[PDB]
Design a protein around this ligand. Sequence first.
Ligand SMILES: Oc1cc(F)ccc1CNc1ncccc1-c1nnc[nH]1
Lengths: 246, 245
Amino acid sequence: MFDPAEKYKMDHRRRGIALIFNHERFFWHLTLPERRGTCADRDNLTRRFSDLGFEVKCFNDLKAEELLLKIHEVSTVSHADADCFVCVFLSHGEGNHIYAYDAKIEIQTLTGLFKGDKCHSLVGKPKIFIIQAARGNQHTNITEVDAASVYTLPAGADFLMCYSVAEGYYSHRETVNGSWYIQDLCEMLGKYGSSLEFTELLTLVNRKVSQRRVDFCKDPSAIGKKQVPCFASMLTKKLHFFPKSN
Amino acid sequence: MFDPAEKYKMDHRRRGIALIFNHERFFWHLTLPERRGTCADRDNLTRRFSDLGFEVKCFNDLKAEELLLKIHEVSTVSHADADCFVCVFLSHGEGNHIYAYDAKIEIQTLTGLFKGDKCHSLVGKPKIFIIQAARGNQTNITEVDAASVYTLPAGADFLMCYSVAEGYYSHRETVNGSWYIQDLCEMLGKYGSSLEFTELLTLVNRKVSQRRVDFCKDPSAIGKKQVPCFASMLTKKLHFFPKSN
Ligand SMILES: Oc1cc(F)ccc1CNc1ncccc1-c1nnc[nH]1
């Protein structure tokens, strides 16, 4: 019966939702810097995920309450007619927390809402989280550099957690072109999104970002600050985004 | 000439070393239970990794000093003539720590010794860590430990492999061994030499997640699912194709 080349079933009526929470500015009294370039990330993702059949829904600078309502809404709607779910965080983070406009939120409580315990329509279907989060500095196209801060957390069965940067390393954001991670993710989605198995592609993104040179830098102190992204797979089958037949 | 199907070069003279640190018993004053079945894990791994061309080196119940010496030795030998490196921990853990016989060791300092910085012969070559570690509870019974060890990343070209994720539970049959390792070794047996290693680890995720936990000998072991994960920092496809002599 058992089959090593078994794929997630990706022939439902709709591909499914892509949430994109995009944070540029923060409440004054948090003392976190503007993330100039995050809009390039939001837009580049919105395009690439649209071309793969996702209903993309972006949300700019939500407060904790607004964000929790929007994500809980999406959790309690039926995904019965959908292949999978994608959720993206473009913000600052620390440890097991992502920053909303006004406060930090436990990543576990966000992934928790799709555990299959709480969201039956997504049991056995891929739940991909993509996280571009790091430590706010707190000092035309400049390259800004943040220290890795967000833990490479796992989640539950059939989750894929995707991280801009690993412990020890550094996250880069061009203020016009956007995050190195997202640039290379979106480029690879453009070329291979609809052909390649998704973790094969994420592996390409690891190569592309690791191979970015950091020896001759505008800023002297940005030198030797490599970026290595990772992903934590709890997936149980091959994942493809083959064109849905229209 | 950038290539989406690019593989790690796996045609060096030797496959490379597999370290297996195997912990069954602990210093009394740590109050950690015997891990009855860990020998089945050690042996099953030793066999499967040997068949793939690894020079397997097992070490039973080392103290912190002995372990750090053995792993530092392996880090400072030349791996120039080798495809890759494998390191396996069968013990208890907590957070970012693995338990030696006498004390806990920071996992980061163990993976640290193979970072491109400190081990030139392994730059660009896969460094796989496999970790069967969880919280000491306190004929063939199934014992159940709560997940405790963080699913830590490492550096470029590392693959960190974990028995269990946060929230879930690790299982060990006291004769047959850990659920994780049983299914890992079975999949290595069938597909080790054909399939890309992360494809296989994905099969292991399916096999372990699908193990039923509804009708259990022990009432309180019911509804305690096991979901393993892996954190890939790999940059290329990884295969263990048979080496020709
Ligand atoms: O992965 C990292 C990224 C960083 F920027 C900094 C540190 C880590 C290592 N921490 C963890 N990794 C995975 C699960 C849990 C933790 C954890 N560390 N303390 C409490 N939980």
